[PDB]
Amino acid sequence: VNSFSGYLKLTDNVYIKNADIVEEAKKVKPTVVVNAANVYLKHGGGVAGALNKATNNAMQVESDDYIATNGPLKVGGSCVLSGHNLAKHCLHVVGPNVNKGEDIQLLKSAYENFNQHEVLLAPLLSAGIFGADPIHSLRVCVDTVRTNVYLAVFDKNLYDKLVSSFL
Ligand SMILES: N#Cc1ccc(N2CCC[C@@H](C(=O)Nc3nccs3)C2)nc1
């Protein structure tokens, strides 16, 4: 039993809700919140910009030190950093950005990072400003993630479409 509330159950391990991931994280304080990161951990917009703003830019300060030490992530890769005031940990995961021409096949590799954590609050990878089809992202999530994932979908119209079209 966990503290996530109001989710629709899609499969044995995948759950979904129309919710602002920032507000959901502040309420649940999950062990892991997933960020829709880029390889530079530059949290300018989309989910990343919103999560970072909610940390009062502390996420960005920590991320800049991480990059200065380690260099950029790989597309499809991840790193674990602090969750600040939102969660115990933040798993920064880089899905392919279609608006940069990146290989959509890397979306499965990106979701594989979730399997290293028993429970996660997450957005749909590569959705929103990353330019992928969110219906496809949900399909890859369900077919790749085996741990317990609670998906927050900001847009109510998109949420209803994701549910109604789910096979
Ligand atoms: N692509 C993409 C993408 C972009 C942003 C985003 N969020 C998550 C939910 C909260 C939202 C927020 O802070 N909205 C506000 N409106 C007025 C004042 S603050 C930001 N999610 C996905």
mmCIF file of N, CA and C and ligand atoms in Angstrom, residues 19-22 45-47 50 53 127-130 154, ligand 1:
data_model
loop_
_atom_site.group_PDB
_atom_site.id
_atom_site.type_symbol
_atom_site.label_atom_id
_atom_site.label_comp_id
_atom_site.label_asym_id
_atom_site.label_seq_id
_atom_site.Cartn_x
_atom_site.Cartn_y
_atom_site.Cartn_z
ATOM 1 N N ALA A 19 -2.999 15.115 -13.655
ATOM 2 C CA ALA A 19 -2.440 15.830 -12.517
ATOM 3 C C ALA A 19 -1.218 16.613 -12.957
ATOM 4 N N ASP A 20 -0.970 17.714 -12.244
ATOM 5 C CA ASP A 20 0.268 18.472 -12.346
ATOM 6 C C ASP A 20 1.322 17.758 -11.505
ATOM 7 N N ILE A 21 2.379 17.257 -12.154
ATOM 8 C CA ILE A 21 3.383 16.449 -11.460
ATOM 9 C C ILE A 21 4.031 17.218 -10.316
ATOM 10 N N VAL A 22 4.138 18.543 -10.440
ATOM 11 C CA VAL A 22 4.686 19.361 -9.359
ATOM 12 C C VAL A 22 3.793 19.282 -8.129
ATOM 13 N N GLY A 45 12.115 24.402 -19.480
ATOM 14 C CA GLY A 45 10.708 24.414 -19.829
ATOM 15 C C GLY A 45 10.116 23.027 -19.720
ATOM 16 N N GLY A 46 8.838 22.930 -20.070
ATOM 17 C CA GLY A 46 8.147 21.672 -19.927
ATOM 18 C C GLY A 46 8.133 21.221 -18.480
ATOM 19 N N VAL A 47 8.119 19.900 -18.301
ATOM 20 C CA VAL A 47 8.154 19.327 -16.962
ATOM 21 C C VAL A 47 9.398 19.788 -16.206
ATOM 22 N N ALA A 50 9.216 23.292 -14.876
ATOM 23 C CA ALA A 50 8.266 23.383 -13.775
ATOM 24 C C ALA A 50 8.824 22.768 -12.494
ATOM 25 N N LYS A 53 11.572 25.123 -11.135
ATOM 26 C CA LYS A 53 10.987 26.321 -10.542
ATOM 27 C C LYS A 53 10.452 26.026 -9.146
ATOM 28 N N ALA A 127 7.081 13.164 -24.348
ATOM 29 C CA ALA A 127 5.844 13.870 -24.650
ATOM 30 C C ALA A 127 6.053 15.381 -24.516
ATOM 31 N N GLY A 128 4.964 16.128 -24.678
ATOM 32 C CA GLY A 128 5.050 17.574 -24.550
ATOM 33 C C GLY A 128 6.052 18.153 -25.529
ATOM 34 N N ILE A 129 6.896 19.066 -25.033
ATOM 35 C CA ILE A 129 7.840 19.775 -25.894
ATOM 36 C C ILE A 129 8.928 18.883 -26.481
ATOM 37 N N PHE A 130 9.046 17.619 -26.040
ATOM 38 C CA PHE A 130 9.966 16.685 -26.686
ATOM 39 C C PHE A 130 9.402 16.106 -27.985
ATOM 40 N N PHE A 154 -0.532 16.241 -17.373
ATOM 41 C CA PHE A 154 -0.989 17.592 -17.052
ATOM 42 C C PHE A 154 -2.274 17.950 -17.789
HETATM 43 N N1 LIG B 1 5.694 19.975 -22.548
HETATM 44 C C1 LIG B 1 5.396 20.275 -21.472
HETATM 45 C C2 LIG B 1 5.027 20.664 -20.124
HETATM 46 C C3 LIG B 1 5.180 21.997 -19.699
HETATM 47 C C4 LIG B 1 4.820 22.342 -18.383
HETATM 48 C C5 LIG B 1 4.297 21.369 -17.501
HETATM 49 N N2 LIG B 1 3.908 21.684 -16.182
HETATM 50 C C6 LIG B 1 3.557 20.626 -15.225
HETATM 51 C C7 LIG B 1 2.228 20.954 -14.538
HETATM 52 C C8 LIG B 1 2.245 22.362 -13.933
HETATM 53 C C9 LIG B 1 2.556 23.410 -15.013
HETATM 54 C C10 LIG B 1 2.606 24.824 -14.420
HETATM 55 O O1 LIG B 1 3.452 25.108 -13.573
HETATM 56 N N3 LIG B 1 1.679 25.668 -14.904
HETATM 57 C C11 LIG B 1 1.443 27.032 -14.594
HETATM 58 N N4 LIG B 1 0.568 27.785 -15.262
HETATM 59 C C12 LIG B 1 0.508 29.094 -14.792
HETATM 60 C C13 LIG B 1 1.354 29.314 -13.737
HETATM 61 S S1 LIG B 1 2.270 27.890 -13.306
HETATM 62 C C14 LIG B 1 3.890 23.079 -15.707
HETATM 63 N N5 LIG B 1 4.167 20.104 -17.969
HETATM 64 C C15 LIG B 1 4.507 19.724 -19.215
#
